[PDB]
Paper text:
Microtubules are cytoskeletal filaments that play various important roles in cellular processes, including intracellular transport, cell division, and establishment of cell polarity. They are highly dynamic tubular polymers assembled from α/β-tubulin heterodimers, which are arranged in a head-to-tail manner to form protofilaments, with ~13 protofilaments associating laterally to form a hollow polar tube. In vertebrates, both α- and β-tubulins have multiple isotypes encoded by different genes, which are intrinsic factors in regulating microtubule functions. The GTP bound to β-tubulin at the E-site (exchangeable) is hydrolysed within the microtubule assembly proceeding via longitudinal contacts with α-tubulin, while the GTP bound to α-tubulin at the N-site (non-exchangeable) plays a structural role and is never hydrolysed. We determined the cryo-EM maps of α1A/β2A, α1C/β2A, and α4A/β2A microtubules in the dominantly populated 14-protofilament type at the resolution range of 4.2 Å to 4.4 Å.
Recently, we reported that α1A/β2A and α1C/β2A form microtubules displaying distinct properties, which was mainly mediated by the C-terminal tail of α-tubulin. Previous studies have suggested that some tubulin isotypes have a distinct influence on the dynamic properties of microtubules; for instance, microtubules composed of α1B/(β1+β4B) possess a faster growth rate and lower catastrophe frequency, α/β3 microtubules display a higher catastrophe frequency than α/β2B microtubules, and α1C/β2A microtubules exhibit a faster growth rate and higher catastrophe frequency than α1A/β2A microtubules. The microtubules were decorated with K 349(E236A) to aid in the identification of α- and β-tubulins in the reconstruction process through the “seam-search” protocol. We then built the corresponding atomic model for each of the maps, including the non-seam region and the seam region. Similar analysis of the lateral interaction between α-β and β-α contacts in the seam region suggested that the α1C/β2A microtubules display a subtle longitudinally contracted divergence between α1C and α1A in the seam region; the α4A/β2A microtubules also display a slight longitudinal contraction (Cα atom RMSD of ~1 Å) between α4A and α1A in the seam region. Taken together, our data suggest that these α-tubulin isotypes do not show obvious lateral effects on their microtubule structures, while α1C/β2A and α4A/β2A microtubules exhibit slight longitudinal contraction between the interdimers in the seam region. In the present study, we assembled α1A/β2A and α1C/β2A microtubules, determined their cryo-EM structures, and found that they displayed similar structural features. However, the tubulin C-terminal tails that extend from the microtubule surface were unresolved, most likely due to their flexibility. This feature, to some extent, confirmed our previous conclusion that the distinct dynamics of α1A/β2A and α1C/β2A microtubules is mainly determined by their C-terminal tails.
Residue numbers in the entry:
A (entry chain H): 2 to 36, 52 to 443
B (entry chain W): 1 to 426
C (entry chain l): 5 to 329
Write the structure that this text describes.
């Protein structure tokens, strides 16, 4: 029972650097590389008294790889695993997918293949990236296409960062997203999306961080992606493996776009004053402003929901919690799945980083929910894409790489088909 | 790893380039001789991007200086950081251009281009992977406007895939220190618009207005203006020079800033800029920095941005700061001034950040803007060129080097096409 | 004073690479004016089927264009479409075969026949040039020494090329020999989608000057025959290496042409011909005193249906444009 966690782009490598410290603190692994089965999923055992993680950080520019090498987690990671390119993607899907990718995918595929051959209990892969930029779109699509053609049946967990409605970091983000999603629709088994302004607001209103940073944003994301696999890592009363996220949450082979959220989020002084029980966290996770994506769930319906709890929590109280949540009529479930709840529990409680913003909580829950609220976000993305497409804005960079307007039109009509499928299944 | 080739042409070009080398050497902690005495390992981590390693722990810059008189070379060699430059790179002729584009592009340019081409080829071969060619020149005068344009054309022919970046100073009607300056500008813009990928348009009167308004200096010389432009020249190149939470190289900012190949004439800016006596009475927080970035008077161009509309802008910050504050500041900036941003783009703003600010400042930023307001500065130079050209004034010197009036007519048509292109998207 | 730019559409037979894969012939013809693809009508001036011969296509396309360009106006004939659409087979064809020869030798033969039929008093002077685009540089195919050419504005600010070997011709045999030499000097590459893939836009210009000794009347005409490359899909082609660098220039040129066409269709103020030199050369063609003709080639296979639709709607945008003739 293992799974390999690969990272692409500045967002991916920063999330990896922010999360592997949490993993090593959870498993008791010091940064030097030394202190039975709990760490076997993400860390190997190299000879005697030494570990190495099952991960690769790949990026075209070297500005992230050299600082990762010269940081503080130097002796923990393999020196050769940190793959570095030679040229900048420059927020260009075509440049990240075609010119610069082709000279390093030959090494990357061989490296993942040889490090997977020694493994035997690999359940799947999880890829960290961001379609809002160039590297995390182009190189991710390039690798996932030739990984799906080779393995195919093995599971792939996509973790992407998407732009806010009113805020955007780049200017070619809708072009990058609409281009890469045309390939992500068929090869990605399931893809969790995160919005920047939602995760800025979640630490503003609750955690009381007036001036947060990307490290503070990535800490709770690392907590989420560690809590989903905490069931595999540690024993539980009702364990859920990685195949549950494929089987239960993907009712159709192309409708595989769930939203994500977490609870409780609380500062140190507020933790001692607020009580921790299942009821308030269950009410807060379904709260619309508490989600990690700026979408209104009230406008749509929940197609499916998997609750994963951590800490000393009995089954009875969570059963009562989901019962009263079902009787609550503020939310609305679709008629095609009345039994739309999948509850699971792990005994190992959440951990806290020394000096981190998060506080010690006796119990926690992560809520990945499949719903139709993302249809509005996709329609918004297509609407803002069409305004620039009509004027042919930022098209000369793409066509000067090797592409044309044909695959732009195919991306547009594929997004239209996605909207058609979502409005059809939401009826 | 992503090395940069530096080339300097003309009097003002080599002056601002020397100041750029001085300030970045001070930031990296490089002695005037060439030895390293820095405190942070990050300075040495990316010293190879500009400086070549030499014996005795010495570092020599990858700089090319080319001038059509020995006086500029003597001055920059006698400057504070003149000895650090390579003696081999001091290529120069004997006779000056005399403020003639034709002499710089045909007669002496042809004689010196073969001398500089192998030198830039050797410097390109020395590094592992050239990223782009950064150049500094002046549309005014003959030397820069001819020789830098010819050098750009030959390097574009030799490397049609690499980035071509230029920090070009251009004239103004209120301050014009040359009689042949509209002619030189009209001839040089025809070559700049077709060959160069990126272009930062700088105006002297804009820097003078800056030094009057916010610096409040009593005796502003060219040294202050060199330090002013060197700040933005370092701000654009900080992303590849140091790590950052959201890095944006030259190609990364170019892809966001260049929506079409011709509309690549930017409007650089930098802040904070304040007097030494008024530093205590200012809060350096990011909202008061961001308002100064988008202030109309703070830009380094004489054009009024409120009279036009921004095609796209980019803000590269330096120093530890909150990404939420940067995001919400850019949000309210693009929202409250929606009339001054084009509606046919959802987000006209790019953001980047570096984690190591300049010495002596805790936070800083640079603004790079492409807007329709540059059409004013283009059309005033265009009509100034036309008024002199319509009676064939100041052309008997140009005809001596085999230059024809059809070339001037083609340049005028190119200027008309460029200003109409900028007027189309307004 | 005002004349619509004439648009023609052609569908070709299915190729060996398409029939063996099992591509369906989705092209459906409803008369000559309109063509239907998946219940989507598209109206043009004349639609040609797979069975239409080279002579039939030439007589329908460029028969009266010879009269128009000889009268005093300008003529520009050029092709558009995707890869493996048949642009080379339409325009170049088989030079040795009288039946399989394309449009360009037939045009020269018609010009010479008209000159022979016309009386001897009207003196003619024909001069040809042949060049192409590679690495964003204009290569003159008639001389190997030159690697880049410049485009300069004439007296009335019409752009045209300079420095090319303007070969003054008198008989058709030397014209055909020069065309064969240019074709031999043309660079071609082998790909999965096409063997003799034309990886560059080839321009063939014929300046015909004429003067009447009796009336002392002079007339000049620039005849452009431009065979453009097809928009190559990277997934379908499997392009890697120098073919990618060729595709960069090809896609830049066709994207600039499409931007010009969209600007002219929507009625933009500036009409950016300056996006590329390939767009600058056709300034007089698209917005001058020229009676332009454009042919779009479409593959009837279901595999290339998306780019077929893109070419059809591109022709629809191009049809509404009017020139200032
Ligand atoms: N901001 C600065 N501007 C300068 C400086 N020196 C000159 N200039 C301005 O640039 C204008 C023309 O630039 P140059 O001095 O380089 C004339 P150039 O050397 O290219 O030709 P020749 O000297 O005739 O060989 C000039 O009229 C000034 O307005 C300077 O040191 N700093
Ligand atoms: N939430 C979050 N998003 C991030 C973080 N870092 C980067 N991003 C997002 O990533 C997007 C761009 O991704 P990339 O393509 O990898 O950008 P890059 O690494 O600089 O690549 P180049 O500019 O081409 O060199 C930006 O728009 C950001 O919104 C982060 O730390 N947290
Ligand atoms: N209309 C047609 N009728 C018969 N055969 C054709 C036709 N079009 C193409 N072919 C066949 O296809 C072969 C190659 O096609 P061709 O070179 O014309 O393609 P193309 O689409 O013009 O190419 P490119 O995109 O490289 O310019 C020709 O030799 C001929 O065998």
């Amino acid at each position: 029972r293992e799974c390999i966690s690969i990272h692409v782009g500045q967002a991916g490598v920063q999330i990896g650097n922010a999360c592997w410290e949490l993993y090593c603190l959870e498993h008791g692994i010091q940064p030097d590389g030394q202190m039975d089965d709990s760490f076997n999923t993400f860390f190997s055992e190299t000879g005697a008294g030494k570990h190495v993680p099952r991960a690769v950080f790949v990026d075209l520019e070297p500005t992230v790889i050299d600082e990762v090498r010269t940081g503080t987690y130097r002796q923990l990671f393999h020196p050769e695993q940190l793959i570095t390119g030679k040229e900048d993607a420059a927020n260009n899907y075509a440049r990240g997918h075609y010119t610069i990718g082709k000279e390093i995918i030959d090494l990357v595929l061989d490296r993942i293949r040889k490090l997977a051959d020694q493994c035997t209990g690999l359940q799947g892969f999880l890829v960290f990236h961001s379609f809002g930029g160039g590297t995390g779109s182009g190189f991710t699509s390039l690798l996932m296409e030739r990984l799906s053609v080779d393995y195919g049946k093995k599971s792939k967990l996509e973790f992407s960062i998407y732009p806010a409605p009113q805020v955007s970091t780049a200017v070619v983000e809708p072009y990058n997203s609409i281009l890469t999603t045309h390939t992500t629709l068929e090869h990605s088994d399931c893809a969790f999306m995160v919005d920047n302004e939602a995760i800025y607001d979640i630490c503003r209103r609750n955690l009381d961080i007036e001036r947060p940073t990307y490290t503070n944003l990535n800490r709770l994301i690392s907590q989420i992606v560690s809590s989903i696999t905490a069931s595999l890592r540690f024993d539980g009363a009702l364990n859920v493996d990685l195949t549950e996220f494929q089987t239960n949450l993907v009712p159709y082979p192309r409708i595989h776009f769930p939203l994500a959220t977490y609870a409780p989020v609380i500062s140190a002084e507020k933790a001692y004053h607020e009580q921790l029980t299942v009821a308030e966290i269950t009410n807060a996770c379904f709260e619309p402003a508490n989600q990690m994506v700026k979408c209104d769930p009230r406008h749509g319906k929940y197609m499916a929901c998997c609750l994963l709890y951590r800490g000393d929590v009995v089954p009875k109280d969570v059963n009562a919690a989901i019962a009263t949540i079902k009787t609550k009529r503020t939310i609305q479930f679709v008629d095609w799945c009345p039994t739309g709840f999948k509850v699971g529990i792990n005994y190992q409680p959440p951990t806290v980083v020394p000096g981190g913003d998060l506080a010690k909580v006796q119990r926690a829950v992560c809520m990945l929910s499949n719903t139709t609220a993302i249809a509005e976000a996709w329609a918004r993305l297509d609407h803002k894409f069409d305004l620039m497409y009509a004027k042919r804005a930022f098209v000369h960079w793409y066509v000067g790489e090797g592409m044309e307007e044909g695959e732009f039109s195919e991306a547009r009509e594929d997004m239209a088909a996605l909207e058609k499928d979502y409005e059809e299944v939401g009826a | 790893m992503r090395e940069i080739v530096h080339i300097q042409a003309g009097q003002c070009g080599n002056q601002i380039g020397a100041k750029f080398w001085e300030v970045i050497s001070d930031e990296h902690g490089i002695d005037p001789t060439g030895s390293y005495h820095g405190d942070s390992d990050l300075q040495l981590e990316r010293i190879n991007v500009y400086y070549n390693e030499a014996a005795g722990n010495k570092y020599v810059p990858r700089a090319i200086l080319v001038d059509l008189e020995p006086g500029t070379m003597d001055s920059v060699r006698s400057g504070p950081f003149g000895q650090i430059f390579r003696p081999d790179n001091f290529v120069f002729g004997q006779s000056g251009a005399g403020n003639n584009w034709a002499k710089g592009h045909y007669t002496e340019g042809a004689e010196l281009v073969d001398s500089v081409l192998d030198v830039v080829r050797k410097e390109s071969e020395s590094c592992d992977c050239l990223q782009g060619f950064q150049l500094t020149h002046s549309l005014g005068g003959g030397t820069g406007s001819g020789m830098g344009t010819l050098l750009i054309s030959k390097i574009r022919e030799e490397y049609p895939d690499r980035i071509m970046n230029t920090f070009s100073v251009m004239p103004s009607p209120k301050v014009s220190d040359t009689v042949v300056e509209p002619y030189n500008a009209t001839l040089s813009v025809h070559q700049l618009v077709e060959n160069t990928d990126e272009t930062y348009s700088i105006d002297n009167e804009a820097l003078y207005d800056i030094c009057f308004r916010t610096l409040k200096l009593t005796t502003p010389t060219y040294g202050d203006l060199n330090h002013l432009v060197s700040a933005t020249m370092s701000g654009v190149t900080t992303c590849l020079r140091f790590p950052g939470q959201l890095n944006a190289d030259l190609r990364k900012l170019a892809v966001n800033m260049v929506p079409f190949p011709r509309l690549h004439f930017f409007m650089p800016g930098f802040a904070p800029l304040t007097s030494r006596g008024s530093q205590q009475y200012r809060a350096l927080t990011v909202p008061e920095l961001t308002q100064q970035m988008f202030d109309s008077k703070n830009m380094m161009a004489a054009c009024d941005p409120r009279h036009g509309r921004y095609l796209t802008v980019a803000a590269i910050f330096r120093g530890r700061m909150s990404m939420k504050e940067v995001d919400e500041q850019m949000l309210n900036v693009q929202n409250k001034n929606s009339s001054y941003f084009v509606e046919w783009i959802p987000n006209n703003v790019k953001t980047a950040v570096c984690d190591i600010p300049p010495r002596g400042l805790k936070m800083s930023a640079t603004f790079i803007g492409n807007s329709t307001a540059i059409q004013e500065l283009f059309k005033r130079i265009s009509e100034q060129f036309t008024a002199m050209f319509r009676r064939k004034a100041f052309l008997h010197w140009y005809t001596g080097e085999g230059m024809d009036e059809m070339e001037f007519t083609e340049a005028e048509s190119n200027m008309n096409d460029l200003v109409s292109e900028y007027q189309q998207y307004q | 004073a005002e004349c619509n730019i004439k648009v023609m559409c052609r569908f070709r037979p299915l190729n060996e690479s398409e029939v063996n894969r099992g591509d369906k012939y989705i092209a459906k013809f409803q008369g000559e004016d309109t063509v239907v693809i998946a219940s989507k009508p598209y109206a043009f001036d004349r639609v040609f089927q797979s069975s239409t011969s080279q002579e039939q296509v030439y007589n329908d396309c460029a028969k009266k264009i010879v009269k128009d360009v000889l009268e005093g106006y300008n003529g520009t004939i050029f092709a558009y479409g995707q890869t493996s659409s048949g642009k080379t087979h339409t325009m170049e064809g088989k030079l040795h075969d009288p039946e399989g020869m394309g449009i360009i030798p037939r045009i020269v033969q018609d010009i010479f026949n008209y000159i022979y039929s016309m009386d001897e008093n009207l003196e003619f002077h024909i001069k040809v040039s042949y060049f192409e685009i590679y690495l964003d540089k204009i290569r003159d195919l008639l001389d190997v020494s030159k690697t880049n050419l410049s485009v300069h504005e004439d007296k009335n600010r019409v752009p045209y090329v300079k420095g090319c070997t303007e070969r003054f011709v008198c008989s058709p045999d030397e014209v055909m020999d020069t065309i064969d030499e240019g074709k031999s000097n043309r660079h071609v590459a082998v790909t999965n989608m096409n063997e003799h893939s034309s990886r560059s836009h080839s321009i063939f210009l014929i300046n015909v000057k004429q003067e009447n000794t009796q009336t002392e009347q002079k007339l000049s005409g620039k005849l452009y025959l431009v065979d453009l490359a097809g928009s190559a899909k990277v997934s379908k082609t499997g392009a890697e290496g120098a073919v990618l660098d060729e595709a960069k220039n090809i896609n830049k040129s066709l994207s600039a042409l499409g931007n010009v066409i969209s600007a002219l269709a929507e009625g933009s103020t500036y009409v950016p011909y300056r996006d590329s030199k390939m767009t600058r050369i056709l300034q007089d063609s698209l917005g001058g005193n020229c009676r332009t003709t454009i042919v779009i080639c479409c593959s009837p296979s279901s595999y290339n249906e998306s780019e077929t639709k893109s070419t059809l709607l591109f022709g629809q945008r191009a049809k509404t444009i009017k020139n200032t003739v």
